[PDB]
Amino acid sequence: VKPVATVHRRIPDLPDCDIDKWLNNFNVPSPLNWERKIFSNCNFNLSTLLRLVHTDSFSCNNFDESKIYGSCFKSIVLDKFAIPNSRRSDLQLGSSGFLQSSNYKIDTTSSSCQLYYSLPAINVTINNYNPSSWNRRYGFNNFNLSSHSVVYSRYCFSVNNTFCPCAKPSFASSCKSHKPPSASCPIGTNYRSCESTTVLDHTDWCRCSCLPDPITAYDPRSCSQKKSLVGVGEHCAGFGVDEEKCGVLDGSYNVSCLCSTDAFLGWSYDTCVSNNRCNIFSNFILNGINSGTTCSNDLLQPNTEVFTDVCVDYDLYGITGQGIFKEVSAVYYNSWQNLLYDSNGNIIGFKDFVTNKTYNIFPC
């Protein structure tokens, strides 16, 4: 609801934003590792953008798309990822499916627009990547899937920095039954909590944490891996790991604690191809309507007249303010750039580019 200043001037010869070139890149990420790019101080054409990418649907929330044409913004933020075919309904606003619970949460309090599009199938190569650093620290490497499979997470778990999923070799060697796998944990981390029990005539029956696995744990309050939903702007904290598959049986101090690949649980995948095209999702966020220098070239700009001898508000080449204007001959404009400054008082004059006239600027 912030109005455009009475006199307004854009910055000439700014580069193009090239939003379509980024959205049409052939290395498309999955929702597990959604990618972000920020655009500012450039020019864009919304009608041309919606066409250069093959758009199926475009709609905005807390905003009307007609209000975009011809406007300027402070910045525009874009997130993108490919859509698993079976999970498309997860992207409805307010949905609680797998995508917005454990991959990417759509902000509903800001001014945003959602864009569904597609690319030819034979050119696309999906890029699957695990962003969790504690999953990679303890043995998670890469995915081995087809060129159109799209990974997504089902559950996410978080831990402190002192986390280690292996049992202590001193403890494991003294177990008489149900011995856990053991290894050495990195310096600074704590060992998996275990316990030696007796029942009937049995002694030294060992029981550790997170049994059977962190998704179906019988005793979650004592399992170090904690369930967590992704907030706005975050990525999944990591896949849960079956601690009974981390380390090796009778392992000693010449083995470092690593988990096998079948120990990472709670994820799946699905193709994105249908009718020879792979479907993609994108999210726009509009920052600072009617300000900044990220402007639309969809409409012809009106040559508003520089009102003289009146107290007026202005937005000149990205700088805002309020003052009175008085035209002066070129002899008294002591510069070559389009703005005239005081040593510290900032704006004291400016030169219009559309008419080459020069003005002084006084306060109200």
Place this chain on the structure above:
Amino acid sequence: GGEDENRCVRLYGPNFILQVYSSQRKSWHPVCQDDWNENYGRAACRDMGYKNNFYSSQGIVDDSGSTSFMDIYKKLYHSDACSSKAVVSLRCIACGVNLNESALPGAWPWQVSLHVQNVHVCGGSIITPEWIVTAAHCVEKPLNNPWHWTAFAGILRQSFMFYGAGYQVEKVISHPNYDSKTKNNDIALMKLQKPLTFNDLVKPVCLPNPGMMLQPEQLCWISGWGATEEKGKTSEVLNAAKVLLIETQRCNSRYVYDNLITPAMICAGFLQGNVDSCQGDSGGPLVTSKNNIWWLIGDTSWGSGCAKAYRPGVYGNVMVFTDWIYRQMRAD
């Protein structure tokens, strides 16, 4: 095998459907209300072993999933459809009724405390005014002699049980297939010398019928004088708490009690961390409510610690011992 006709008699379901076994069709079948009175009901209750006991008998709609309708003195008249469309259901004793921190009086009227040398040792449950169900591991040698044991009923505090004021035990019967190593078939019966007098504080609990249709995680209750810690002193006051059944296959998995639960056992409690479920002691009751009647499901047998993760309580499975109990109660 001197079987005059064949087999005996039972009750079925949570509505006590009177059923008989037929030698010609080799199956169980209900009994039609047609030409049935109270004197015939006392012949059925004495047959199972309840002796002079009898409570009620009426006719209802059949829900035992049976199609064909209708021992010594076998009035065998088979058919396929009852007249008046009514099957008879009878109860042989008034049981399964109670009232409506510490337990209130009348809340668990079937609970008893069993003493040896003037100190509490085990617990038990009342089924008839002379019979008590307990655990077999309470009465190993040398405690097989029935003279060591006395019972206290209707009393909630240990300091209120004075030497010489407890009912004397007449005989104790262990299960013929008990084994102390594995604790399989851990159940035993005790018989009193003089019968109790039932009232608002002392009442019996019903034995379980076939076809109970218990849920996978049925809600249950336990009671006793057990300590909160596994080595603590006996509680002065009686307590109780809720527990849930745990399916046998889950209880028998590698992460619980690996291959230690037999068909004669049943698990109940919680697999999570810090829930105190140690109120009961050996031989105590495990009961559940269904159709507004309290049923005896198990007697507490063994476990592993108090309020520990992965380690619930194990009980003797009463349903599979109902025949053996009916036979011991019949051989007076």
